[PDB]
Every structure is written in structure tokens, then in C-alpha cells.
Coordinates of C-alpha atoms in Angstrom, one line a residue:
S1 CA -160.6 -69.2 126.6
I2 CA -158.3 -68.5 123.5
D3 CA -154.7 -68.7 123.5
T4 CA -152.5 -65.5 122.6
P5 CA -148.9 -66.3 121.9
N6 CA -146.7 -63.2 121.9
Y7 CA -143.6 -62.7 120.0
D8 CA -141.2 -64.3 122.6
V9 CA -142.8 -68.2 121.7
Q10 CA -142.6 -67.2 117.4
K11 CA -139.9 -68.9 116.7
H12 CA -140.8 -72.1 119.1
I13 CA -144.0 -72.5 117.4
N14 CA -142.2 -72.3 113.7
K15 CA -140.1 -75.2 114.7
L16 CA -143.3 -77.3 115.6
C17 CA -144.9 -75.8 112.0
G18 CA -141.4 -77.2 110.3
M19 CA -141.6 -80.7 112.7
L20 CA -144.4 -81.2 110.9
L21 CA -143.5 -80.3 107.7
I22 CA -140.5 -82.7 107.5
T23 CA -142.6 -85.2 108.8
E24 CA -143.8 -88.2 106.3
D25 CA -147.1 -88.9 105.9
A26 CA -147.7 -86.5 108.7
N27 CA -150.9 -86.0 111.4
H28 CA -152.0 -83.1 109.9
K29 CA -155.3 -83.0 112.3
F30 CA -153.8 -80.1 114.5
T31 CA -151.9 -78.0 111.7
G32 CA -154.8 -75.7 111.1
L33 CA -154.7 -74.5 114.8
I34 CA -150.8 -74.3 115.1
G35 CA -150.5 -72.5 111.8
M36 CA -153.3 -70.1 113.5
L37 CA -151.3 -69.6 116.6
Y38 CA -148.0 -69.3 114.5
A39 CA -150.1 -65.6 112.8
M40 CA -151.3 -64.9 116.4
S41 CA -147.4 -65.2 117.5
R42 CA -146.3 -62.8 114.3
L43 CA -149.4 -60.5 115.2
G44 CA -148.4 -60.6 119.0
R45 CA -150.5 -60.9 121.9
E46 CA -151.9 -57.0 122.3
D47 CA -152.7 -56.8 118.3
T48 CA -154.4 -60.3 118.6
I49 CA -156.3 -59.2 121.5
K50 CA -157.6 -56.0 120.2
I51 CA -158.7 -57.8 116.7
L52 CA -160.8 -60.0 119.1
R53 CA -162.3 -57.6 121.1
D54 CA -162.9 -54.9 118.1
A55 CA -164.6 -57.6 116.0
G56 CA -166.9 -58.2 119.0
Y57 CA -165.7 -61.3 120.3
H58 CA -165.6 -61.9 124.3
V59 CA -162.0 -63.3 124.6
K60 CA -160.5 -64.8 127.7
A61 CA -156.6 -64.7 126.9
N62 CA -154.4 -67.5 128.3
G63 CA -150.7 -66.3 127.7
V64 CA -148.0 -68.5 126.2
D65 CA -145.0 -70.1 128.1
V66 CA -142.2 -72.5 126.6
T67 CA -141.6 -74.7 129.5
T68 CA -140.2 -78.0 130.1
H69 CA -141.7 -81.7 130.1
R70 CA -139.4 -84.4 131.1
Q71 CA -141.2 -87.5 129.6
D72 CA -140.1 -91.4 129.9
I73 CA -140.0 -92.0 126.0
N74 CA -138.5 -95.9 125.7
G75 CA -137.2 -96.4 128.9
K76 CA -135.3 -93.0 128.9
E77 CA -136.5 -90.0 130.6
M78 CA -136.2 -87.2 127.7
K79 CA -136.7 -83.3 127.7
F80 CA -138.9 -81.5 125.9
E81 CA -139.6 -77.8 124.9
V82 CA -143.6 -77.3 124.7
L83 CA -145.8 -74.3 124.8
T84 CA -148.8 -73.9 127.9
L85 CA -151.5 -74.2 125.2
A86 CA -155.3 -74.5 126.4
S87 CA -155.9 -75.9 122.7
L88 CA -152.9 -78.5 122.5
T89 CA -152.0 -80.9 125.1
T90 CA -148.4 -81.2 125.7
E91 CA -148.7 -85.3 124.9
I92 CA -150.1 -83.9 121.3
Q93 CA -146.9 -81.2 120.8
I94 CA -144.3 -84.0 122.4
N95 CA -145.9 -86.1 119.8
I96 CA -145.4 -84.1 116.8
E97 CA -141.9 -83.8 117.9
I98 CA -140.9 -88.0 117.9
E99 CA -142.4 -88.5 114.5
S100 CA -140.5 -86.0 113.6
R101 CA -137.2 -87.4 115.0
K102 CA -138.2 -90.2 113.2
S103 CA -138.6 -88.6 109.6
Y104 CA -135.0 -86.9 110.4
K105 CA -133.0 -90.0 111.3
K106 CA -134.3 -91.5 107.7
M107 CA -133.4 -88.3 106.0
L108 CA -130.1 -88.3 107.1
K109 CA -129.1 -91.8 106.4
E110 CA -130.3 -91.3 102.7
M111 CA -129.2 -87.0 102.0
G112 CA -125.9 -88.4 104.5
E113 CA -126.6 -84.5 105.5
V114 CA -129.2 -82.0 105.8
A115 CA -128.7 -79.1 104.2
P116 CA -130.9 -75.4 105.9
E117 CA -133.7 -75.6 103.2
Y118 CA -134.4 -78.6 104.4
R119 CA -134.8 -78.3 108.2
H120 CA -137.3 -78.0 110.3
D121 CA -135.7 -74.9 112.2
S122 CA -135.9 -73.3 108.4
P123 CA -137.2 -69.3 109.4
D124 CA -140.0 -69.7 106.4
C125 CA -141.7 -73.0 108.4
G126 CA -144.6 -71.2 109.9
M127 CA -145.0 -68.7 106.7
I128 CA -145.0 -72.1 104.2
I129 CA -148.3 -73.4 106.6
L130 CA -149.9 -69.9 106.6
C131 CA -149.7 -70.7 102.4
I132 CA -152.6 -73.0 102.0
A133 CA -154.4 -70.7 104.6
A134 CA -153.9 -68.2 102.2
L135 CA -155.6 -70.6 99.8
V136 CA -158.2 -72.2 102.1
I137 CA -159.3 -68.4 102.8
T138 CA -160.6 -67.9 98.8
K139 CA -162.9 -70.6 99.1
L140 CA -164.8 -70.4 102.6
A141 CA -167.6 -68.3 101.1
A142 CA -169.0 -71.6 99.2
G143 CA -169.8 -72.4 102.6
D144 CA -168.6 -76.2 101.6
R145 CA -165.3 -77.8 101.6
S146 CA -166.2 -78.0 97.4
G147 CA -162.7 -76.0 96.6
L148 CA -160.0 -78.2 98.4
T149 CA -159.7 -80.2 94.9
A150 CA -158.7 -76.1 93.6
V151 CA -156.6 -76.0 96.4
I152 CA -154.4 -78.8 95.7
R153 CA -154.4 -78.2 92.3
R154 CA -153.2 -74.2 93.2
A155 CA -150.6 -75.3 96.0
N156 CA -149.1 -78.1 93.9
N157 CA -148.3 -75.3 91.4
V158 CA -147.1 -72.1 93.7
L159 CA -145.6 -74.2 96.5
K160 CA -143.7 -76.6 94.0
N161 CA -140.5 -75.6 95.7
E162 CA -141.2 -75.5 99.1
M163 CA -143.1 -79.5 98.6
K164 CA -139.6 -80.9 97.4
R165 CA -137.9 -79.7 100.3
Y166 CA -140.9 -81.1 102.4
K167 CA -141.8 -84.5 102.9
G168 CA -144.9 -83.2 105.0
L169 CA -146.5 -80.5 102.8
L170 CA -149.5 -82.4 102.0
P171 CA -152.1 -80.0 100.6
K172 CA -154.8 -82.3 100.8
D173 CA -154.7 -82.8 104.7
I174 CA -153.1 -79.2 105.6
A175 CA -155.9 -77.7 103.5
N176 CA -158.7 -79.7 105.6
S177 CA -156.9 -78.9 108.9
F178 CA -157.5 -75.1 107.8
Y179 CA -161.2 -75.7 107.0
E180 CA -161.6 -77.1 110.2
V181 CA -160.2 -74.1 112.3
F182 CA -162.7 -71.9 110.3
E183 CA -165.4 -73.6 110.4
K184 CA -165.2 -74.5 114.6
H185 CA -163.3 -70.9 115.2
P186 CA -164.8 -68.1 113.2
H187 CA -162.8 -66.1 115.0
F188 CA -159.9 -67.4 113.3
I189 CA -160.9 -66.1 110.2
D190 CA -160.9 -61.9 111.5
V191 CA -156.9 -63.0 112.8
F192 CA -155.3 -64.5 109.6
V193 CA -156.9 -61.2 107.2
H194 CA -155.6 -58.8 109.5
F195 CA -152.6 -61.0 109.7
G196 CA -152.2 -61.5 105.7
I197 CA -152.8 -57.0 105.9
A198 CA -150.2 -56.4 108.5
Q199 CA -147.7 -59.3 106.6
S200 CA -148.6 -56.9 103.4
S201 CA -146.1 -54.8 104.9
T202 CA -142.9 -57.1 105.5
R203 CA -139.8 -56.0 103.1
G204 CA -137.4 -58.9 103.0
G205 CA -135.6 -61.6 100.9
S206 CA -138.2 -64.5 101.8
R207 CA -139.3 -66.6 98.5
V208 CA -142.2 -68.2 101.0
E209 CA -142.7 -64.4 102.8
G210 CA -143.6 -62.9 98.7
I211 CA -145.3 -66.4 98.0
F212 CA -147.5 -65.5 101.4
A213 CA -148.6 -62.0 100.0
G214 CA -149.0 -62.7 96.6
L215 CA -151.7 -65.6 97.6
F216 CA -153.3 -62.9 100.1
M217 CA -153.5 -60.5 97.6
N218 CA -155.2 -62.8 95.0
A219 CA -158.1 -63.6 97.8
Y220 CA -159.4 -59.8 97.0
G221 CA -159.8 -60.3 93.2
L222 CA -156.3 -60.7 91.6

């Protein structure tokens, strides 16, 4: 059973990536998975399944819906928008949002107001996460995590502006999370490569879409 998010949940996954990105000392244990869910939501359900089935994988597609979860958090009943995912519990998704709200409160106090580029819902949050994946993909051939140092050094240079925008953009933690998903679920390698090849045809004014395209092309010999 594999979760196959469609276009309708793409914006929600982007916001979930953004929640991790605004979180100081974020627990990036699920970031590799969330990043891959974002890439699958860009491809859409039909293309994801085609990629997996064509690559010889036997996949039982799990539809991904946005639902409301009511939960008592510190005495008060709270409403949370979560995804129905076999790979990611409601609890984990809610804890990510709760932690992000604590970092948001801290930032709002220090800055006074939070400009668009510092927000968890900025349109480029999912692509920021996938830039780390584009670096990790170059180092998978070694069959070990030896390339981690080089991924961190490269991310600190290429994602300098994105790192100034987001306290949760911790290349070591995010890169290890991608190494983990690519090692545990090698079907995500195929999904990531097909996503990158399809993304190359994106023509727009997004800095991070441009950074991603450059990093993805570099994995091919630049």
C-alpha cells in the first residue's frame, strides 16, 4: 500500500513542508517522506501510479483526502486539517503543526510582523525541501551516507537565501531524512527522477523552481 496524493492536496502538503521549515530545531524524521508526498502531488495520482507500475512495482494506491481532526490540546478542543495517509499518522501531522505554531509565535514577537517569504504557506516551501533531495540523489550511488558532508556544504551555498528565510532549513537533518526514504523505499528514487524530469519544463518566475532545475541537471553531469 502506497499513498498517492493528487493535485487537490498539493497546496496542503506545500504548507506542511512550510510548517517544518519555520520550526526551529525541527524534527525532520518525516521530512524525506513529506517531500516525496509533495513530488507525488505535483505529478498527480495517475502519473505516480504509471511511473510505479511501469518501473515494475506492485502498488496498491491509497487515495489521499484532507480531513478535519478535533483534538483536545491543553484543555481546549482544537480543529486540525490533516491528510489521510497510511505512511503518516494524524498524531505526527498535528504535532508538526503544533510545533510550527510555537516557532511562529516566537518569530511574530521578535519581528513584529512576518513578511511573505518567512511564512509557512509561501508557494515555494515544497520545492525548497526537494532541493535537498536533488543533492542527496547525486550521492546514492556510493551505497552509503559518505556524501552527507558534501550535501551540507553544497546546500549551505546553493540554498543560502532559503536558509536565511527558514530556521527549520537544516541541511544535515533534511538530507538524512532523504537518505533514509531512498534507502527504505527505493520506489521513491524513480518517483523523484520522473518528477525532476517533468519539473524541467516549468517556466515561471520562482527562484526555488530555478534552483531545483539547476541542481537536478547537475545530477546528470554539470
